[PDB]
């Protein structure tokens, strides 16, 4: 290729390498924050699920109005993470219909809405954005729970889908169930719990919903930051490799151009 063309390509690709390195370091810092911010929130959330594992709260197959929540940010450079939950959603979001059960959908994050739009635009009842631009906070989960309750879709069996942060190297797409008051007040595993009305359970569920959503927010944010670290580092390595290759090509073209200039100079000198 022309010397100037590869020159411009080299400059642009070097700029890409520098910007990716900067953003990789930024994402590393944000992960360092998220891991600490998640050490206590993991205890809190895992506590908020103690009831539904010490009590055999089964799924009452009769009930059909289901609900699916998928968590993810709106930022995109992270990549893999979104492609995970989206897929996980679709699968389950399909099988529920394969039983005559309805399915609504809440999308936490732009990317989920974007990915699922084409084939599920009819099912989104509410959607949320500006997640991931800041570290998620319990106020965010309270707002999501308020919008899940106010909007009068009394789901009978829900599911939240997130990328539990397994470790720096990898995550894992998990799905925590969600029970409505009906499945709780009519479970013969909860005849022991004392001094509970049918209104105490209402408040308890309207709180545990926020608990689980906040748990998912924290897990998803940590896993997303780790995946962003890895992806940005991989892109930096790719840019470095391609810079090496194109710089070698540039050296070859530079030598060729110098040789052409020399031969033209000597030919002109003889012909002068």
């Amino acid at each position: 290729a022309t010397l100037k063309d590869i020159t411009r390509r080299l400059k642009s690709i070097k700029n890409i390498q520098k910007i990716t390195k900067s953003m990789k370091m930024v994402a590393a810092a944000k992960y360092a924050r998220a891991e600490r911010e998640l050490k206590p929130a993991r205890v809190y959330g895992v506590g908020s699920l103690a009831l539904y594992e010490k009590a055999d709260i089964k799924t009452p197959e009769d009930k059909k109005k289901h609900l699916i929540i998928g968590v993810s940010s709106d930022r995109g450079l992270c990549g893999a993470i979104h492609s995970s939950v989206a897929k996980q959603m679709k699968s389950e979001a399909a099988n529920l219909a394969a039983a005559g059960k309805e399915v609504k959908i809440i999308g936490v994050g732009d990317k989920i809405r974007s990915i699922l739009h084409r084939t599920h635009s009819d099912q989104f009842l509410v959607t949320f954005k500006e997640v991931g631009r800041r570290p998620p906070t319990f106020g965010d989960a309270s707002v999501i729970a308020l919008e899940l309750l106010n909007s009068g879709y009394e789901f009978d069996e829900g599911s939240i889908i997130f990328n539990r942060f397994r470790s720096v190297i990898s995550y894992k797409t998990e799905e925590k169930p969600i029970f409505s008051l009906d499945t709780i007040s009519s479970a013969e595993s909860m005849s022991i719990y004392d001094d509970i009305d049918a209104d105490v359970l209402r408040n308890y569920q309207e709180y545990s919903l926020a608990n689980i959503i906040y748990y998912s927010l924290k897990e998803s944010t940590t896993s997303e930051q780790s995946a962003r670290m890895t992806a940005m580092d991989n892109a930096s390595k790719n840019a470095s490799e391609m810079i090496d290759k194109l710089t070698l090509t540039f050296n070859r073209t530079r030598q060729a151009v110098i040789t052409k200039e020399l031969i033209e100079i000597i030919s002109g000198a003889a012909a002068l």
Binding site: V126, F128, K129, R134, P136, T137, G139, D199, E206
Partner: protein, 47 residues
């Protein structure tokens, strides 16, 4: 049933208000960091 369930609220609004009170009753130097990690950055897009 409480007076805020007759009025038509939910335990989430109740607990939001109670937490906001407990927070803006804090000693000033704590309140700075308490306000952080207690916001609400979400905005809702209506379908």
């Amino acid at each position: 049933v409480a007076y805020w369930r007759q009025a038509g609220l939910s335990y989430i609004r109740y607990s939001q208000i109670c937490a906001k009170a407990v927070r803006d009753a804090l000693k000033t130097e704590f309140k700075a960091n308490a306000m952080k990690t207690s916001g609400s950055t979400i905005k809702i897009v209506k379908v």
